[PDB]
Amino acid sequence: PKWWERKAGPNMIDITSAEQFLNALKDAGDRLVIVDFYGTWCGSCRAMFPKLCKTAKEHPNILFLKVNFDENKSLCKSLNVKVLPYFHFYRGADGQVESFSCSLAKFQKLREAIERHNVGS
Numbered sequence: 001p002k003w004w005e006r007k008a009g010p011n012m013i014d015i016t017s018a019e020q021f022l023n024a025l026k027d028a029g030d031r032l033v034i035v036d037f038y039g040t041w042c043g044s045c046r047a048m049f050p051k052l053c054k055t056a057k058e059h060p061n062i063l064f065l066k067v068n069f070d071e072n073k074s075l076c077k078s079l080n081v082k083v084l085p086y087f088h089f090y091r092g093a094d095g096q097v098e099s100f101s102c103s104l105a106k107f108q109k110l111r112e113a114i115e116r117h118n119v120g121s
Contacts (some may be wrong), residue, residue: 012064030092037086048104
């Protein structure tokens with residue numbers, strides 16, 4: 001049971017290809033989408049994961065995409081991801097609306113981004 005699968009709820013999906021990633025954004029409709037770029041051996045990513053999972057339970061209608069950088073290097077490079085943890089947000093016809101790094105200590109940055117782009121904001 002890999003650390004990134006523990007207590008991961010139904011709105012948290014593993015992405016394993018560029019095709020799957022693009023299909024996920026398309027099928028999201030007008031939902032807010034949070035893309036979590038993480039590394040297998042990223043201590044910060046691992047430390048912040050339980051809080052991310054709680055946030056996913058707190059927001060059942062937000063779609064969370066987990067993208068393992070180490071297993072999706074070309075995809076992550078095409079998305080200009082250079083450091084981990086990293087987050088993109090996407091929302092409907094607006095496409096990408098956030099791009100930022102985070103950690104457990106500054107987790108409120110992620111919530112602030114939700115405040116800016118959640119359905120009804």
